[PDB]
A paper describes a structure:
The [name]-CoV RNA [name] 2′-O-MTase is a heterodimer comprising [name]-CoV [name] and [name]. The [name]/[name] crystal structure shows that [name] adopts a typical fold of the S-adenosylmethionine-dependent methyltransferase family as defined initially for the catechol O-MTase. When bound to [name], [name] is active as a type-0 RNA [name]-dependent 2′-O-MTase, ie., active only when the [name] guanine is methylated at its N7 position.
We also report the crystal structure of the [name]/[name] complex bound to the inhibitor Sinefungin. Soaking the crystals into a Sinefungin-containing buffer captured this MTase inhibitor in the SAH binding site almost perfectly superimposable on SAH. Inhibition of the MTase reaction by Sinefungin therefore probably occurs competitively. Sinefungin exhibits an IC50 of 0.74 µM, 16-fold lower than that of SAH as reported by Bouvet et al. Preliminary examination of eukaryotic non-viral MTase structures from main classes as defined in Martin and McMillan indicates that the SAH adenine is bound tighter in any of the latter enzymes than in the [name] SAM-binding site, indicating a possible breach to achieve anti-coronavirus selectivity with a small molecule inhibitor of [name].
Author numbering:
A (entry chain B): 12 to 85, 90 to 131
B (entry chain A): 3 to 135, 140 to 292
Write the structure that this text describes.
């Protein structure tokens, strides 16, 4: 029902946030890849690139708009792989919603990226 | 054996002329070997592709791959995600399913597979199509009849297929067609070994009979093999992914006429050194 709840909200991302704050389970069935864990660590990559501290997921399965079958606000994820911090891997869709990729080094701000 | 991505039907069993028996195997269960947070289908397709790595697959620069039965009740395409991981970058991956799902493929075709039309030929066909099944075990039609025609009309010479079968979900013409390949086998993935599921894999398509296979017999042969050779579940192969992606072979693609396809060309097709098809623009239908 989380997919519907967000699908039929004026602001799906806000709707997802509210859903979580009220004790809803994160969206499941994000597709975890099997990988080496010796990758570049970058946020969004052509192939799994999880480093030792990440998991690699199929991109579309981690996209709220893909999963809800609704219009995108722009897809940066579909057909690609998203690296997600193991500690956040329970909620890959939320992670990609709440976070932003650094446009210089290509890592997640507040996570993999270290810059000024 | 436990280290292998799975087990291929040994030649000894392919040679038999068995009668059709019931299979002593339960397709289901909680699976003790699937690593945590990993889907059965990611594990299963991973092992399938690990197996395909050991074969002389043709790998053109502009590879074309079509994936049938890509969707699931979950609404996502785990198998497609693995294919997309396995194949060379910017390989055309098209997938299809009867019901809607989200995909990491370039195109997703929704609808019965019988509605899927294309002018272009493919280098690799993967099918995971399945209908959950009457007191007899006969060749099943449905998607299998489409598949056989698809293979015959749209698989490039040199191309390869992997088609999911089980005890009850199998087709006699598909088995027959396996003998139009340079090599074939029935492959059981180690993570799902206690199920009657296998992938019929044809390697390097020749467009003509190499062997005379009787479908009904070969399926009995398959069952006999499964009944008398239990396989211990295993996910050993999953713990080293370092060599996973398919090798960039740069396999030549040539458009040849039937009269140009001579013994030395067949020999090239048999060895996985040639693909024969046009290089036109790829258009796929509803
Ligand atoms: N006639 C048909 N045409 C197209 N798809 C079919 C047909 N019959 C069964 N299927 C599909 O076969 C699929 C079987 C699934 N178990 C495949 C799982 C999927 N390969 C995965 O990676 O998880 C279902 O999604 C069905 O919709
Ligand atoms: Cl959130
Ligand atoms: Cl491998
Ligand atoms: Cl036979
Ligand atoms: Cl060559
Ligand atoms: Cl073409
Ligand atoms: Mg050979
Ligand atoms: Na017969
Ligand atoms: Zn998306
Ligand atoms: Zn940065």
């Amino acid at each position: 029902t989380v997919l519907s709840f967000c699908a039929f909200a004026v602001d799906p991302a806000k709707a997802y946030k509210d859903y979580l704050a009220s004790g809803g389970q994160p969206i499941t069935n994000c597709v975890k890849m099997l990988c080496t864990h010796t990758g570049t660590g970058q946020a969004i990559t052509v192939t799994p690139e999880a480093n030792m501290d990440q998991e690699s997921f199929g991109g579309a399965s981690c996209c709220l708009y893909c999963r809800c079958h609704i219009d995108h606000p722009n897809c940066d994820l579909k057909g690609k792989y998203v690296q997600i911090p193991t500690t956040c891997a329970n909620d890959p869709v939320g992670f990609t919603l709440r976070n932003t990729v650094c446009t210089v080094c290509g890592m997640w701000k507040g996570y993999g990226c270290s810059c000024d | 054996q436990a280290w292998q991505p799975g087990v291929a039907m040994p030649n000894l069993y392919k040679m038999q002329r068995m009668l059709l028996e019931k299979c002593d195997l339960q397709n289901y269960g909680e699976n003790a070997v699937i690593p945590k947070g990993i889907m059965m289908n990611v594990a299963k397709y991973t092992q399938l592709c690990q197996y395909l790595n050991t074969l002389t697959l043709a790998v053109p620069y502009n590879m074309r791959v079509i994936h049938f039965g890509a969707g699931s009740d979950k609404g996502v395409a785990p198998g497609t995600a693995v294919l997309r991981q396995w194949l060379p970058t910017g390989t055309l991956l098209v997938d299809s399913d009867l019901n809607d799902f989200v995909s990491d493929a370039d195109s997703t075709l929704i609808g019965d597979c019988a509605t899927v039309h294309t002018a272009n030929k493919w280098d690799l066909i993967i099918s995971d199509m399945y209908d959950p099944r009457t007191k007899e075990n006969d060749s099943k039609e449905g998607f299998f009849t489409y598949l056989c025609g698809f293979i015959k009309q749209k698989l490039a010479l040199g191309g390869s297929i992997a088609v999911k079968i089980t005890e009850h979900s199998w087709n006699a013409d598909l088995y027959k067609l396996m003998g139009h390949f340079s090599w074939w086998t029935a492959f059981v993935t180690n993570v799902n070994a206690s199920s009657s599921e296998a992938f019929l894999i044809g390697a390097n398509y020749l467009g003509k009979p190499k062997e005379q296979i009787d479908g009904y017999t070969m399926h009995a042969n398959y069952i006999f093999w499964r009944n008398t050779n239990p396989i211990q579940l295993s996910s050993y192969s999953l713990f080293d992914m370092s060599k996973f992606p398919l090798k960039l072979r740069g396999t030549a693609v040539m458009s040849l006429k039937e009269n140009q396809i001579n013994d030395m060309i067949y020999s090239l097709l048999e060895k996985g050194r040639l693909i024969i098809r046009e290089n036109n623009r790829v258009v796929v239908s509803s």
